[PDB]
Every structure is written in structure tokens, then in C-alpha cells.
Ligand binder design. Structure first.
Ligand code: NAD
Ligand code: NAD
Ligand code: NAD
Ligand code: APR
Ligand code: ZN
Ligand code: ZN
Ligand code: ZN
Ligand code: ZN
Ligand code: ZN
Ligand code: ZN
Ligand code: ZN
Ligand code: ZN
Ligand code: ZN
Lengths: 252, 252, 252, 248, 240
């Protein structure tokens, strides 16, 4: 109920190094479907098939069609959950965001420190000649429904710098994520089923370290019982109410 | 004269996707001495306390004072070897440089693609507040014996982005280096003893993939037998000779 | 009598819960070539292509050709190293073997506790109808020049119960190995370059727990510095010498 | 007989930028069999099985064994040479060929566009690894069909255009440019039935270039030519050259 | 883009182009320091520490390196278009970027000499001490008179280098100025010499110069951003 939101807000209000872990859930209200439930059904291709380093090579066009598909929009924008987190960062509470999302919606919402376990599409590399590119370089190509193509050698294997099925995670980033869980005073999960490594392990790491924990998700997860506050609902509706309640605690 | 140099130039002049792997020996002519023993080094200091991530988190000063004592050249500049390799890239022959060095001399010399397997002294991170700095902000203070401290929070936990004991190699970079060894048509080693992974294995990976193999080192290595050309000598002297010869073949 | 061997023995002689971690190097002398250096170069095919889950499905014949390849011998049986380790367990010194090998040589040598991080060829499963099989059941088939084939449904998808490239590492067996390292009093690496996760992590975990560390390998590894005793040599020749010394030390 | 060839020498002699389009017939003199017409291979073999991509993916051993049956170490004949001399003389500017025998190069021709690729390089359809013919040249002669040394696949396809496959893009591009920028286009030993290669003669014809065709028999595309010579390339081409040295 | 395309057209058609560079490529001093004491040969013999202290305080940036304009010019030479680079810069950036024929009108810091025992040195032998804030000292005799081969007030400009640069201007087919105000000789005159000889003129600067009128192509912008773009367009005009 509203009571759970109260306790979440009370934990955050007295934290100065909170960490927020987000999954596909936090971006569903931005038009980017998750890989679960009806969303997984909605999507045509199987992510493990078309979104692997193998699939990318055998059929780059399908990879892009799958990766860019959205609900009633071409490009996504941050929803109130993203802004709510960036706000908490301005209020001196949130000092880091660890995400498995590759949509860069946290940065665009104003988050200053974002650890991207799966990278992002901010940059791309030609796998044949190694020319590097900024996302902005193919804006016109995408606009007309075409896929990225290397201007230097003509290759269609311009791979975005994200972790595809069959590749390792960014270690400098993985290490920072764990170290982040190890010294945060509050650890809040938002929009994650806590299934994809290290999502299932970070919560236990932060708890051992003594952090207070909160989880905001549309459905329950196996780790729910170890959290202090459990909230079932949409991230875009819950987070902003938590922020407001934190402001009210600091005001009144 | 020198059949080896001519042969090396012949192979390169004919390759369109060559890779260069470099070790500490390529920067010896820039003023940065190589290991020289390395075993005795661990007789003076406990490797776990001065060069491991665990030792760093326990007492930062140990790592930094260890570094000041074995400091050496801090303002070294690339030497002829580094430039020769950059020239080869400009000529459309070399497509990537894989290195174990952390001095960034390859980039400063013009190389556009450098895969740093052991990280580099480019940037540092405060482990407490996450502020990031360029090594250029601490070099001089460090040269005066001043341990770098975070200017924003005052922490003594400013960790450089280099690989320490206890932490894994940068996976995505290693992954790229290996792909590089598998599809190159020419693989050249310069100034590396090829004793420990990955230095010790990449040559064998390129060899199995069918690339031509060249090695330029001051002393033989156990991997020598698989090289099509082997040259004994100083990189800073040999490399420019090979390039000159390649240019001549190109101009005929 | 090499002094490092003697030192390794003194450590084991005073241990009552030693753990041995083995890599491909401990079976090379049994005739199973490793994936590194000359062995890797000598082997037919590229491991990641033929020994991956997709390679197995598209070309089982190549997978079995790769898996059964022998070097310097025609069939594999435990070598002196495997027996030495089994003896150390009989002497009440070694309490567990953690291995990444799938050859079952440790069990054949008599070791009772063996944690198989990558599973083993001991069991096979038809991926189509799920009939399960013992390795012994296909011995005659291999001798006649055929590859395993499900006797119940005719499929050639009889996958040995091992971890193939492209498949995740067994999580429960991984956690048991970590726990093993956290409570041993001696941790000895034999025939591993400590490159394949978690081979590079386990030694550090044991060191933090206070274990005495020993490493026996044909070449130096990146983690060599943290071990108390380092021995360069062939496992099959070194291990029995260590055990003979341990028996002498206990003689009085 | 002379009237036709005499007229042919007249055009080439006056030609400033001539292009030669060759088919399997120009290599008949070298012992290599043609595909269609008389004694053609497509009468003693099924192309859909031994020379089609669908057939290769179906049973790679068919293509490779068919290829082993044709193991014949061939050398240029007077036709290939006549074309190379016509090039040294500055008349012929480039040769577009559908053959993979590489007899045009060995004969001394510098401008050779292999519209249908060559056995020079190969690709594994499974792991995408690439190889030079030299890597299999020894197992092939011993009767062993090429097998990828990286993934063990039996789908190592040489870079030759089989039925159901597109032509190499860069090469098709170069060829069309030549068919456009030419005043003389000569076809030699080509049935002109396989497209899009057979389209080049029309592309050059519609661009205003004189058309000459030397073939051992009339092709169903003769009309487009200003003059056709029905005979053997090894005998007709050499005579075309000398007659050009008489005029020139 | 417009002027940039024209510049490329000229360079693509030329076979003996010459490039002149000033300080503006590496994008009151004499009120803070006394030039007569920190930058003249008489001041140096009087007190070498003044010149070296002046240099240390004005070192600029650490781990300095060539920028994209230097690499673009080196590339133009590699393409066989540019045959010489005349510069007033003393930081060896053109050579490091790959240029093979560089005429340094003001000398450079790459070579130094002890004025007492005449031992010669490369800058790499002092760069460490310099950046640590220690004055370069002769290791053979101990003297503090280690002077780099740069032109100091009271010393002459390299005569032979100057004449070679004058000759380049007299026989080039294209002359391109990059990052120079063209106010002081010889910088102010070389463009006029090339102009009179019949070469195509190009100038890339952040600001206009009084010599602007004689130039066939005038581009305003940062050299680091303009040159790579000119080089690209030149490659594009060679693919066709
Ligand atoms: N960058 C992206 O936006 C994006 C999109 C799809 C998948 N992926 C990534 O791929 C992996 C697998 O994805 P996945 O979807 O299977 O796992 P996930 O755990 O990241 O999935 C989302 C979870 O969100 C919950 N959820 C859905 N809508 C929500 C809302 N409005 N508010 C709060 N919670 C909501 C669901 O109950 C589900 O458990 C993850 O690592 C994920 O982050 C990224
Ligand atoms: N434990 C061991 O036995 C051992 C042995 C060697 C290296 N290592 C480790 O491996 C890493 C470094 O390996 P690396 O190969 O870069 O360095 P390295 O020190 O092993 O080898 C440098 C090589 O360069 C050669 N060399 C010296 N001057 C040269 C010049 N001017 N031109 C050309 N060659 C020259 C030497 O002969 C030597 O083989 C380090 O992290 C180190 O701790 C461990
Ligand atoms: N079950 C098997 O026998 C088997 C065989 C090959 C690979 N694999 C597995 O695949 C992975 C990768 O294999 P890899 O070979 O790249 O890694 P690895 O680290 O396991 O490789 C072997 C290491 O063995 C050392 N070595 C070789 N011969 C030796 C001997 N006689 N005595 C002592 N050391 C010796 C080498 O120096 C090298 O560092 C590992 O996890 C490995 O266990 C298993
Ligand atoms: N000595 C000779 N001189 C000139 N022409 C000759 C000679 N001997 C035979 N010919 C003629 O050469 C022509 C060759 O035609 P094809 O066999 O159809 O060969 P081509 O035009 O090269 O087209 C074949 C294409 O189909 C295959 O699938 C393959 O890919 C090949 O490139 C025939 O019309 C034949 O009569
Ligand atoms: Zn490219
Ligand atoms: Zn933090
Ligand atoms: Zn800080
Ligand atoms: Zn590459
Ligand atoms: Zn079955
Ligand atoms: Zn135990
Ligand atoms: Zn293959
Ligand atoms: Zn002196
Ligand atoms: Zn000149």
C-alpha cells in the first residue's frame, strides 16, 4: 500500500550513498518492452537467436529490427521513474545507478553516475576494418528504416558496444558494481526480476555489507524476503511517490 | 643486407590486416627499463600488499610508495619503434596494436587502435566518491613523493585503471585481441618475452589461424620456432628499417 | 631433490584439509593435449567452433573427433600425477580435488572427492528423447569407428554431460568450489594457467582464508607471485616426488 | 569466310577501346570441355546437382567429385594469346570472362575480369573461415574433398558463381562500366544463355559499340552483332590479329 | 564546406604543394617576463636559469602530442601531394606526426648543446628533469649552459633553412598556410613569393589576415577540424 512507500521513503531520507539497480522493468513505461511475459510474446525473434554475436553476423538486419522495435514510438524517452532516480541523486541520496539496460535512459534523465553492465549503443565499431562511430552518425540511416553501414569499407557489421549473448561483461564496470554494493548504505532494485547475473547476487552482497534494501517491481522475485521493503507496482507510478514522500519528510 | 629485415618487410608489404603485439621491450628505448629479474622484486616487497586489489583496499599508500620507489621514467616519449608502428597503420598495413604496456606510448605516437591488456595510466578513480582524474593531475605531485589524494573528498583511495593481482584481465579487450589474432594475415611481436598468458598464447592463436609470423626481440623466446621471421635486435632500430624497406617495395 | 619440492612437501605434511585444483596440464602426460601452446596448435580444429553447443549440434562427428584426440598415446589412463593426488587423499592430507577436466582421470586414479566444474564424459544424454547413458555403453561403438547414437530414438544428439563453450558454468558446483577454497588449509594448483574462470579467483580466495599455497605448472602464471611455493615442471614428474618426500617427513 | 573475318579486323583496327567477352569455347583448344553445344558437359552431367548452390548445400561431395573428374593442368592456346597481343597492341583494353581456368592471365592478359569468380579462394559456409586454394590443393589431388580445418565442416565453397548465386558485386560493376565505355565489343566462345553475364553484350550494343562474335556455332543472340564468324577461336582469332597488323 | 571543397580540388590537382604553419595550428607575455633576460642569447649567457625557468612556467600541457591537423598534413605528403612543410613552430610536432621534410625556421627544442664543453644532447635526455622542475645540466662537464637549438633574440635565423624555404615557395604549384597571422618575416613574405611564382594559394586560419586578398581559397576555422575534412575530400576526388 502507501505504507510500503512510506517506509521506503524513510530509509532513503536518511541515506547518503544509496544505489539503485534497474532492469528492463524500469523502461517498459517508455515503450521498450521487456523480454518477459506478454512483452516476450510480443517480440517476434528470440533474443538468444538474433541478438547473439553469431546472429548479428549471420543477419545484421534482423538484429537491428529486433533491437529497435518499440511500442508506438521510434525512439524512447525517460519516464518518471528515470527522472525520480536522477532527482534522488540531486537530493544527495543516490550516488550510483547500476543498470542492465542499454537504452541510456538514466543518463538522459540526468543521472551522473551510471554503471552499464551490458554497455550501450552510444558507440559502434566496424568488425571488419575497426572504424569506430558515434550513435549520432547513423541517425539518417535509421530514420529511413536502414541499418548502419561502415562509411570506410562498406561493411554491414557495425556492432553497437553492448554485450550480446556470447560475450563477457565489462569488468571495470562489473567490479565497480560489486564494490558499489559493498559500500552503499541503501540498495534499491527497480524493474528487475533479479535473474541475469549478477542481478541475483548483488542484493546479498549489499545485505551482508549492512545496507537497507528496497525493491520496486511489477512482480515478486525469489529474493523478496531478504529485502526490508517490498513494493508491487509500476516503476513510473511508485518511484515519483517515493521521492515526493522523501521531500515531505525533509519539509515537514 | 640482413635477410630477416628484408623478409619481414616482404611479408608486411603484402599484408592488408597486420597486428602488432608489444611488450615492455618496445619502450626500453624510451627510458622505461624492463622487468630484469622480476623474481627478486618480490623479495623486497610483498606482492599481495603493494600490487593486489586486496592490498590496495587495505592500505593505498603501500601501492603508491611501491610505485614511487620503482618509478623510473614518468615523462617518457614514444621512440622510433612506436612511430614506425604508427606509420605502418597509416600505410594501411597494421590494423591493430595489442599491448601489455601501460605507458600509452602507442597512442601518443599516432596509433588509432590500441588494445591495452593490462590497462593504462590514463585515468584514476577515487574508490570512495567515484570522482575520476587524469594521471596528468597527479604526475608532478607523485614525482615529489606525494601520494595522490582525492581533491573532492580527501580520500587516499585513488586507484589507477591498471590490472592488479587478484583482479581479472579486461575481458572485452582480451576478447577483441583474440578475435584480432584469429583474422589477421600478419602477426608481429615486438619486445615481449611471451612467457605468460595472454602474451604467451596469442602468437599460437594467430599461427593456427594461418597468419604470417614475425618477431623482433633483443633475445630469443620459447615461441621462436613458430615464427616465419625472427630478428635479434633493438625495436627502435629494427622497426624503422623494416618500414623503410616496406616503403621501397611499395615504390617499385 | 629440488628445494621447492621439499618445501611443498613440508606444507602438505602439516595439512589435514588440503585442496588440489587441476587444469588440462595434469592430463597432458596421459595423452590428452591441452588447448594451449604447442598442444593447442597441434590439435585439429579451433576449440570454440567444434566444442561449442552449436558446433556439437551441427557437426557431432567433428566434436567427437576433437574430444577424442590423443597425442603421444592412443588411449588415456591416469598418469603418476593423478595417482599421487589420490595417494595424498589416502594419507588423510588431501580432502578435495577441484578440476576443470572432463576426462574422469581423477576418479579413475582413486580420488573420492572431485568437484567437476565442467562436468564430465561419464554420463551422456540424448537431447531429443532424454534417454541417459553411461560412457561404458559407447565403448564398443567408438572402437567400431562410430559416434554415440541414441538406441531409443536414433538421434545423434547424445551430448556428454559436460560444459561446452557457449554454455554457462554450473552455478551450484561453482559455489561448492568457492566454499572449498574458503576452508582449506593448503591449496595446490597443478597443471593450470589460472586463466579460465574461476581458476584465477580460487587461489586468491584460499589465500585470504589463510591457506598455504603451492603451484606446480609447466609454465609461470600471472598469479605466481601469491603462491608460497612455485614449481616449474611436468605434473607427472613433480607430484610423485612431492608425495615420496611427504612420506619421508611422516616417517619420523 | 574471309568477308566476315576481314570485316572483323577492320573494326578492331579502327577501335580505340575494345573489350573482349569470353566463354568456355575460347578454352576448347586447351583441352577444356565446354558446357553447352557440342560435347557439352551439361549433357553428361546435371548442373542442378554438381554446379548449383542448392546442390552444394545438399551434397557437397557431388560438386567436389565432379570437380575432380575434370582435373586437367591446362595451358593457353592461340586464342588466349591472340587476345593478349591485341591488348599489347593497345586495341583491347580489358577482358571480361565467364571462365575460371585463368588461361587469360597465364597468356599475358593484364585486364581480366572474372565475372564468375575463381577457385583461387574458398569460404566455409559454416564458420565463415576463408582459405586460398593452396591449402587444399594437395588433399584434392589425392582424392580427398576439402574440409574446413577450423570447424570440420564439409561445406567449403570455392568463390565461383554456381547456379542460384549472385555474381561478385565489385567485378560485375567493373564489367558493366567497360561494356559502356567501349567502341568495340567482341564475344568469343560463348553460348550467351546464362544471365546476367549475357546482358553485357546488349549493354555495349545499346551504348553504340560495334559487335563481333566468334563462336563455333550460331547463338540465339546473333542479330545484335554487326558481324559473326562461325569457327574455332584458336584459328579465327590469330588470323584477326595479323590482318590487323596488315591494315594498321 | 564550400571553400573546403575548392581547397581540396587544388591539392588533388597539385604535385608539389608546400604547407606553412604557425602557432595557430596547435590551437602580454613580454609584460610578465623581460624578453632581454629570458629569451635572448645575451640573457642566457648572463643567467641560463632565467630562460629555463621561463620555459618551465610556460610548458603548457603534459604528454603533449600532434593534433589532427599535423596528421592530416603528414597524410597529404604520404599521398605524394605535399613536398615540404615550413614551420615557425619549435615543438617537433610535424615530424612526430609523420612529415619527412620539415623546414624549421626558428629551430627546435629537439637538440641542445653545452656552451662550455660542446657535448650535444637530444631533448629526451632532459625531458624528465625538465618536467620535474630541474634545470638541464651538462652531464659531461657539469655546466648549466645547456642551450636548445631554438632561435633566441640576438641570434640569426637558420640561413640555409630560410633559403630552402624561399626556394620551396618559388617552385611549388600550391602553397597552403595553416595557423599563421602572416605578420612577421619570413612568414609575411613567403605567401607573396609563392604568389608571384604562380602557385595556387590557400589559407586556413581562425581569423583573417592582411595577406588574405592574395589567396585563391580562404577558410576560417580551427586547423584541427578543417584539415582532416580537406584531406577526406581529396581522397574522395581520387577514388573517381
Ligand atoms: N535496455 C532495455 O530497456 C532492455 C529491454 C529488454 C531486455 N533488456 C535486458 O536484458 C535482460 C533480460 O530481460 P528480462 O526482461 O528478461 O529481465 P528483467 O528482469 O530485466 O525484466 C523486467 C522485469 O520487470 C518487471 N516489470 C515490467 N514492467 C514493469 C514496470 N512498469 N515497473 C516495474 N517493473 C516492471 C517484470 O515483472 C520483470 O520481472 C536484462 O538484463 C534486461 O535489463 C534491456
Ligand atoms: N614469473 C615469470 O617468470 C615472468 C617472466 C617474464 C615476464 N613476466 C610477467 O609478464 C609481463 C610482462 O611481459 P613482457 O613481455 O611485456 O615483458 P618482459 O619483461 O617479459 O619481456 C620484454 C622482452 O623485450 C626484450 N627487449 C629488451 N629491450 C629491447 C629493445 N630495445 N627492443 C626489442 N626487444 C627488447 C627482452 O629480451 C625481453 O624478452 C609482466 O606483467 C611480468 O610480471 C613473468
Ligand atoms: N579434461 C581434459 O583433459 C581437458 C583437456 C583440454 C582442455 N580442458 C579444459 O578447458 C579449459 C582450457 O584449457 P587450456 O588448456 O587452455 O587451459 P589450462 O590452463 O587448463 O591449460 C593447461 C596449462 O597446462 C600447463 N601444462 C601443459 N602440460 C603440462 C604438464 N605436463 N604438467 C604441468 N603443466 C602442464 C601449461 O603450461 C598451461 O598453462 C580448462 O578449463 C581445461 O581444464 C580439459
Ligand atoms: N574452339 C572453339 N572456338 C570458339 N567457340 C567454341 C569452340 N568450341 C566450342 N565453342 C562454342 O563455345 C560456346 C560455349 O558456350 P557454353 O558451353 O554455354 O559456355 P559459356 O558461354 O562460357 O556459359 C557457361 C556458363 O554456364 C555454366 O553454368 C558456367 O557457370 C559457365 O560460366 C558454345 O556455343 C560452343 O559451340
Ligand atoms: Zn569498416
Ligand atoms: Zn559508491
Ligand atoms: Zn573522492
Ligand atoms: Zn582486425
Ligand atoms: Zn533419444
Ligand atoms: Zn573441504
Ligand atoms: Zn568451418
Ligand atoms: Zn659540458
Ligand atoms: Zn620543393
Amino acid at each position: 500500500m502507501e505504507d510500503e512507500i512510506r517506509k521506503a521513503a524513510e530509509i532513503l531520507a536518511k541515506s547518503k550513498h544509496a544505489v539503485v539497480f534497474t532492469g528492463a522493468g524500469i523502461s517498459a513505461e517508455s515503450g521498450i518492452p521487456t523480454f518477459r511475459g506478454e512483452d516476450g510474446l510480443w517480440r517476434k525473434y528470440d533474443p538468444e537467436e538474433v541478438a547473439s554475436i553469431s546472429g548479428f553476423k549471420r543477419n545484421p538486419r534482423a538484429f537491428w529490427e529486433f533491437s529497435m522495435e518499440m511500442k508506438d514510438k521510434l525512439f524512447a524517452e525517460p519516464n518518471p521513474a528515470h527522472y525520480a532516480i536522477a532527482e534522488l541523486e540531486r537530493m544527495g541520496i543516490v550516488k550510483a545507478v547500476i543498470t542492465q539496460n542499454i537504452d541510456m535512459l538514466h543518463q538522459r534523465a540526468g543521472s551522473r553516475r551510471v554503471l552499464e553492465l551490458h554497455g550501450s549503443m552510444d558507440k559502434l565499431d566496424c568488425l571488419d576494418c575497426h572504424e569506430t562511430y558515434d550513435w549520432s552518425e547513423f541517425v539518417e540511416d535509421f530514420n529511413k528504416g536502414e541499418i548502419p553501414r561502415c562509411r570506410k569499407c562498406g561493411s554491414y557489421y557495425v556492432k553497437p558496444r553492448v554485450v550480446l549473448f556470447g560475450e563477457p561483461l565489462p569488468q571495470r564496470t562489473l567490479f565497480e558494481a560489486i564494490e558499489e554494493a559493498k559500500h552503499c548504505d541503501a540498495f534499491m532494485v527497480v524493474g528487475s526480476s533479479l535473474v541475469v547475473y549478477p542481478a541475483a547476487e548483488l542484493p546479498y552482497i549489499a545485505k551482508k555489507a549492512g545496507a537497507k534494501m528496497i525493491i520496486v517491481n511489477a512482480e515478486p522475485t525469489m529474493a523478496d524476503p531478504i529485502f526490508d521493503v517490498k513494493i508491487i507496482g509500476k516503476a513510473g507510478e511508485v518511484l515519483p511517490k517515493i521521492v515526493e514522500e522523501v521531500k515531505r519528510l525533509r519539509s515537514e
